[PDB]
Amino acid sequence: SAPLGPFNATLLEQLKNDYQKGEKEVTRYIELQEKVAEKYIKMTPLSVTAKKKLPPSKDPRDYMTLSPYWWPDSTKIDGLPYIRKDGERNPEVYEYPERENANRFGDAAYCLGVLYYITGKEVYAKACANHLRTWFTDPKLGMNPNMTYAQAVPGMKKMRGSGFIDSRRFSRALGVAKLIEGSKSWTPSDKKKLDDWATAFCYWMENSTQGQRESHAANNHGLWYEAIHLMVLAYLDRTDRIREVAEQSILPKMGAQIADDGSLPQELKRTLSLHYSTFALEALMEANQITSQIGINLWSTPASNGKVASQAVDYLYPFYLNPEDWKFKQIKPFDQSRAAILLYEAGTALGNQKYVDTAKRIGLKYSTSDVETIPYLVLKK
Amino acid sequence: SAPLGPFNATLLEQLKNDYQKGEKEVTRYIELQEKVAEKYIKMTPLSVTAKKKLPPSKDPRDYMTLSPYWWPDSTKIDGLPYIRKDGERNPEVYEYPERENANRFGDAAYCLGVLYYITGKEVYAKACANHLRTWFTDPKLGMNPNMTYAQAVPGMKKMRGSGFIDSRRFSRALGVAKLIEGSKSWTPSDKKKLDDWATAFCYWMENSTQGQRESHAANNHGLWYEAIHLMVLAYLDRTDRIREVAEQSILPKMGAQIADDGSLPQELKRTLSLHYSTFALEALMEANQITSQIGINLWSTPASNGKVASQAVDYLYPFYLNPEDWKFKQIKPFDQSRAAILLYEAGTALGNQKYVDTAKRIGLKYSTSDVETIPYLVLKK
Numbered sequence: 110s111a112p113l114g115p116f117n118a119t120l121l122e123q124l125k126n127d128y129q130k131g132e133k134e135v136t137r138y139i140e141l142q143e144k145v146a147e148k149y150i151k152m153t154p155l156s157v158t159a160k161k162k163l164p165p166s167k168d169p170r171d172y173m174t175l176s177p178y179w180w181p182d183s184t185k186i187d188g189l190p191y192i193r194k195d196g197e198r199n200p201e202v203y204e205y206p207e208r209e210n211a212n213r214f215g216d217a218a219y220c221l222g223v224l225y226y227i228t229g230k231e232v233y234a235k236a237c238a239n240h241l242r243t244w245f246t247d248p249k250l251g252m253n254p255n256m257t258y259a260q261a262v263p264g265m266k267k268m269r270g271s272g273f274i275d276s277r278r279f280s281r282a283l284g285v286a287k288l289i290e291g292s293k294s295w296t297p298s299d300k301k302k303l304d305d306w307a308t309a310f311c312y313w314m315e316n317s318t319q320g321q322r323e324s325h326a327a328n329n330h331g332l333w334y335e336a337i338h339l340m341v342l343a344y345l346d347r348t349d350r351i352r353e354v355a356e357q358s359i360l361p362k363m364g365a366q367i368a369d370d371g372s373l374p375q376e377l378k379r380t381l382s383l384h385y386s387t388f389a390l391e392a393l394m395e396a397n398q399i400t401s402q403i404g405i406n407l408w409s410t411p412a413s414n415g416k417v418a419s420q421a422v423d424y425l426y427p428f429y430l431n432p433e434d435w436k437f438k439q440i441k442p443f444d445q446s447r448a449a450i451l452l453y454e455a456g457t458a459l460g461n462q463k464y465v466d467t468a469k470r471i472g473l474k475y476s477t478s479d480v481e482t483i484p485y486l487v488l489k490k
Numbered sequence: 491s492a493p494l495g496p497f498n499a500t501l502l503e504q505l506k507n508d509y510q511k512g513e514k515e516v517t518r519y520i521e522l523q524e525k526v527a528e529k530y531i532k533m534t535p536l537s538v539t540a541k542k543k544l545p546p547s548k549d550p551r552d553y554m555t556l557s558p559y560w561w562p563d564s565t566k567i568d569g570l571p572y573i574r575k576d577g578e579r580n581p582e583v584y585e586y587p588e589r590e591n592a593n594r595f596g597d598a599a600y601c602l603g604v605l606y607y608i609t610g611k612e613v614y615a616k617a618c619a620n621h622l623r624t625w626f627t628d629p630k631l632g633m634n635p636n637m638t639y640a641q642a643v644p645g646m647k648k649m650r651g652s653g654f655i656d657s658r659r660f661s662r663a664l665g666v667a668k669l670i671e672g673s674k675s676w677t678p679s680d681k682k683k684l685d686d687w688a689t690a691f692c693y694w695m696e697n698s699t700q701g702q703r704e705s706h707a708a709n710n711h712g713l714w715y716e717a718i719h720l721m722v723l724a725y726l727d728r729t730d731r732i733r734e735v736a737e738q739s740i741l742p743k744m745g746a747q748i749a750d751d752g753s754l755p756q757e758l759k760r761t762l763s764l765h766y767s768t769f770a771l772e773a774l775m776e777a778n779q780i781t782s783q784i785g786i787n788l789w790s791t792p793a794s795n796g797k798v799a800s801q802a803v804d805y806l807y808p809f810y811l812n813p814e815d816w817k818f819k820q821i822k823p824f825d826q827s828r829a830a831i832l833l834y835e836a837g838t839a840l841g842n843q844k845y846v847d848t849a850k851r852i853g854l855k856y857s858t859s860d861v862e863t864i865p866y867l868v869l870k871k
């Protein structure tokens with residue numbers, strides 16, 4: 110029985126059971142995953158402090174990125190204030206090292222923690238712990254538990270909480286830290302410091318103005334906010350708060366954001382409307398991984414108005430079959446492969462065999478190193 | 491008469507003449523351009539050596555970039571060899587600093603040299619000179635005169651010349667250096683070093699295997715190769731070679747790439763077929779800016795096979811009016827504003843009033859800081 114965390118616990122337990130029983134398909138699969146994971150054992154742990162351009166706090170431990178759709182205005186002498194081009198990512202985002210480094214850290218810690226849970230090999234806990242300590246708790250290298258300067262925008266006058274959605278890149282690693290508890294490498298002192306960091310980060314996201322505003326967002330930002338919220342809460346073992354968040358925030362959001370025909374109108378008005386419809390449901394999918402570990406199925410549980418997330422999948426399913434049929438603005442091609450895990454997660458939760466079959470028909474590559482696909486051998490045959 | 495260089499000499503001459511006569515509309519325009527150019531006066535000159543990851547030569551003065559559409563293969567343990575996804579730019583390109591630094595250098599040197607030509611103010615030549623010396627001729631900071639490691643691809647076994655097309659970002663700056671000849675800041679020694687660098691770069695692109703291959707390319711690479719060739723040759727005042735390149739290479743190559751309906755089949759098979767159809771003609775446009783200064787009009791002179799570049803504009807013109815009508819793959823939106831200067835250049839060269847009218851109707855913003863628009867007050871209202 111897997112510890113509470115941000116993953117499909119059923120697939121992880123099934124993998125760990127079959128690996129321990131010596132089943133050959135799984136054992137061979139885990140040996141490939143172990144060869145993929147070797148680069149993470151070697152990898153020097155990253156830190157948010159590895160930047161030259163400092164945030165307005167002057168603190169290198171404050172996370173800071175550029176909001177991706179904001180560009181210099183060439184008709185202004187200094188390019189200020191920046192203006193928005195929805196769906197067009199400003200390559201200036203890559204000047205903020207934590208944008209990609211949070212992803213690299215998150216990939217490394219997630220892969221290593223999952224492999225330590227499956228195999229029991231201490232070398233994976235040791236490396237996972239080294240990534241965790243440097244990113245989160247180190248008194249010089251760890252990030253401050255806030256997202257004050259996430260997705261800042263040059264020239265913008267008002268505070269926004271929009272950058273909080275960046276947190277999903279390290280909050281999954283926070284959740285996976287639970288899997289290395291009880292190893293020799295993760296000491297009681299390591300756990301306390303991370304518990305304290307997670308408590309401070311949870312306080313910030315629940316009580317800061319930016320956190321409050323993001324918690325009330327009318328589109329996929331509010332859904333992702335609560336998915337991140339559940340990762341922090343599950344890490345801290347606050348299962349009653351997970352129940353409260355699901356009933357008092359996630360379900361009302363679903364009832365409000367799904368229209369009667371199952372479309373997501375807030376995502377339909379975006380220039381990448383098929384991507385953002387899918388991204389909304391991906392937030393629910395990762396939230397559901399956590400709630401269903403305590404008996405709450407977000408795919409089939411109605412809001413007060415009777416709407417259910419399965420209605421959102423039904424609306425999009427034909428377009429996952431044929432993205433070319435999509436009738437709203439989508440100014441870059443849609444990657445059909447993201448529907449694999451999503452249709453599998455929703456399909457199993459709903460007992461919809463047609464969703465599961467489609468997920469397997471789309472599939473994932475057997476040998477892919479994409480760390481989010483580790484639990485999904487079921488999609489790789 | 492303006493020196494031979496990579497610009498619309500007719501518009502530059504008209505700007506300098508009206509500025510010197512004190513015409514208010516032009517005088518006000520140049521004062522805006524001077525405010526825009528102030529950042530280039532202050533800006534620290536860039537160098538190709540400002541990289542940590544060195545090229546296989548171990549020489550920081552060797553230019554190196556990643557070919558943009560090549561991505562790690564996630565089904566390989568080390569991601570090697572990279573694989574191609576046409577039209578999808580891999581953000582790893584921004585890890586090679588000279589990719590964007592060549593752009594920044596090119597903008598600053600072009601703007602400063604043009605403003606010195608128009609205004610005669612020594613401060614623009616002095617700053618222009620500082621950028622040229624550091625980028626090109628400095629014995630520690632200047633780039634080696636080759637493109638051996640331009641658009642390298644990890645894991646790729648064969649040499650390619652495809653990265654030569656990067657050169658357009660600094661070959662325009664090379665060409666405008668002619669505009670500061672005779673200033674106090676550009677000494678006879680500065681000229682000799684740049685002449686010698688340009689001679690060596692001309693030798694490399696004509697005689698290296700990579701240069702030979704790029705010169706033979708059947709698509710827009712071959713057109714840009716010759717546009718760059720003409721910038722170098724014009725910088726060196728080799729007017730006889732310019733005529734020979736125009737007559738014996740550009741026109742046959744342009745003629746070979748135009749189908750019977752005026753489409754460019756090599757560009758139609760790209761995932762960004764409207765962008766690359768336009769990019770092919772932009773090569774011809776910058777080439778024609780140089781050829782027409784010695785009496786050779788590339789828009790109206792037929793090739794050996796009877797094809798003429800005006801046929802390609804005629805094919806694309808309706809789609810510049812309405813880009814949404816384009817019927818070939820274009821997996822990102824097309825920037826209609828790119829058609830303004832193209833239709834003006836071709837329209838003026840062809841005496842086609844309908845092209846010129848559309849060029850002005852699409853227009854360019856009066857206050858834009860885009861340095862390539864500096865000569866085009868005629869498009870700014």
Ligand SMILES: O=C(O)[C@H]1O[C@@H](O[C@H]2[C@H](O)[C@H](O)[C@H](O[C@H]3[C@H](O)[C@H](O)[C@H](O[C@H]4[C@H](O)[C@H](O)[C@H](O)O[C@@H]4C(=O)O)O[C@@H]3C(=O)O)O[C@@H]2C(=O)O)[C@@H](O)[C@@H](O)[C@@H]1O
Pocket residue numbers: 176177178193195260271272274328329330385388
């Ligand atoms: O690249 C990444 O970091 C990930 O991006 C993910 O998409 C996020 C972005 O990072 C932004 O946060 C983006 O914010 C949007 C809001 O969702 C919203 O559309 C907002 O709209 C405002 C608008 O700014 C303006 O003020 C107008 O007048 O009103 C609008 C309104 O309220 O309707 O604009 C924000 C913005 O662009 O700043 O949103 C997305 C998101 O929806 O999650 C994601 O694509 C991920 O895959 C990337 O990895």
Ligand SMILES: O=C(O)[C@H]1O[C@@H](O[C@H]2[C@H](O)[C@H](O)[C@H](O[C@H]3[C@H](O)[C@H](O)[C@H](O[C@H]4[C@H](O)[C@H](O)[C@H](O)O[C@@H]4C(=O)O)O[C@@H]3C(=O)O)O[C@@H]2C(=O)O)[C@@H](O)[C@@H](O)[C@@H]1O
Pocket residue numbers: 557558559574576641652653655656709710711766769
């Ligand atoms: O990002 C930038 O620096 C600028 O990019 C400009 O577009 C260039 C690219 O930089 C690449 O060089 C790209 O190279 C293409 C070739 O044009 C060609 O399509 C080639 O196709 C090959 C293919 O690689 C393969 O070997 C196959 O079997 O055969 C194909 C064939 O010959 O048909 O692939 C190259 C590649 O992608 O490596 O081409 C463009 C270009 O056409 O100029 C430009 O977009 C500019 O705006 C950017 O600033």
